[PDB]
Each structure stands twice: as structure tokens, then as C-alpha cells.
Amino acid sequence: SHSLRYFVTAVSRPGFGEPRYMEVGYVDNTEFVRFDSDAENPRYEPRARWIEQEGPEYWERETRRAKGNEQSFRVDLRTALRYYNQSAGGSHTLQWMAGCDVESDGRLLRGYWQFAYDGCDYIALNEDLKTWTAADMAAQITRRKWEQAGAAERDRAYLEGECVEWLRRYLKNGNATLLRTDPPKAHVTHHRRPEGDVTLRCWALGFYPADITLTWQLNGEELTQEMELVETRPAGDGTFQKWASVVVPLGKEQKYTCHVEHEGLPEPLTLRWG
């Protein structure tokens, strides 16, 4: 499955300037375009090398779309203050994410066209791509407005057509790097703790994509017995990192083996303290 998605943010700062507005496009979690209102003459900019082959028309068109979108959000931020009876003094955040997830076949697996206000769901186009689910009565006002205007049809047209068409185009533009798989450079560290036992930590560095499965086994078994791990984390260069550890009795380290699973590994890895 592959995806083309745009993440948009509008943050107000009443009395101190126009709302900060941002748009970020991603193809399978890879950022390729971004528009930041914070510049003298803001425009959409390339973020991946494979999007630089898009001609000038494309960039001026998207820049115009982004500015048009920025205007709607300024109005939205004002409307939200009235819907929620809030004062014009505080900063508020309005977010939007729209895009498509398309199966290997070219069929639309799932479409997105949803919003959030101050950190939580506000409204979302349902999977039927026809009706909406509102988070509260304020958002219900929006829903009634959009259903009566039939705004969903316009959104669905984009999700099933243009979004899908361009995702396919992008996947060709970036064939070389959008499907890259950097295998993990794995090693095991041994730490003796005050408790008397030992912490065996299995490390995985410089891999890509972020997806990965690190597991520990005892004499080749279901060592799911509570192991410690951390959230997969990024590096400046775009690769990821992760580790998983378990406590073991000092003297029986060679009994435990770490197994690393990753898309870039034709065959899973098995490491020992050795």
C-alpha cells in the first residue's frame, strides 16, 4: 500500500500577526513538499530530490492553492472562536490532513479529509466518503453546513482521482529512493546492574524504513516475558534507531539471543553477547 497525504496547520496569535500557516506533503511518510507562511514571499518548496523535476507551473499552482487554503483557515480560526465562545486573546490551533492510501492494484484503500481544533478531533469525512462524523455540537454546525452544501462530493473527487493519479506519478518520480531499505547495523551491549544481574540491550542503528521487530529469546523460545524497549527514533540523516533489553542472571548470557527483523534484511539476524 502507498500514500500521498498533506498535513496542514494554522496557529493564531491575535494582536501579534496573521496566523502561522504550514502545509507538508508526504508520500509514504517521506516529506517532499512544504509551504511555510513565514517568509516575505512564501511559496511551496521541494523537500525531496525527486520532486525537483516538477516544472515551474506546478510550483506556482501549488503555491496559489496553499495561499487560497491559508485564507480559508484564517476565517476558520475566527469562526471557531464564536462557535466556542472564546476570547480573541488566546492562541488556537486548527489542523487538517487529507490524502489517499492506494493498494498495489491502484484501488483506493482509504481516503482522509479530517480536522482538529486545539489538539483534538473536530470533524472527519467518513470512509463512505459521503458523510461526516463531528466531535461535538459546534462541529455539528459545520457538518450540517457541509452536508447541505454537499462538500463531500468535491472532497471525494480529489481523493479518488487527483490524489490517486499523482501518488502514482510521485512513485515513479522517486522510484530510486522511496522504496529504499537500509538494513539495521545491530550489536549487543552488556550492562551489569546493582541488583546483581545483567541488562542485555539489543541495538539496531541506521536502518530505513522505521518499521522493525526486535525480540529476545531464551534458549530459542518465546521470551516475550516482559522485555524493555524504546520508541523507534530518528537521526539527522533520516535513518532510524531502536533497542530492546531484558535482565538476565550473571553467568548465563549466552543463553539469550536477539532476533532482528527488517524489510532490508533478506534473512533475520540473530545476535548473542558473544
Binding site: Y6, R65, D76, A98, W166
Partner: peptide, 10 residues
């Protein structure tokens, strides 16, 4: 290419 709000405000 991205989505357009097309002035369909909340």
C-alpha cells in the same frame, strides 16, 4: 498535488 479548501469553511 494537494487538496484545496476552495473556500468551504467550517
Amino acid at each position: 498535488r494537494g487538496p484545496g479548501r476552495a473556500f468551504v469553511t467550517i
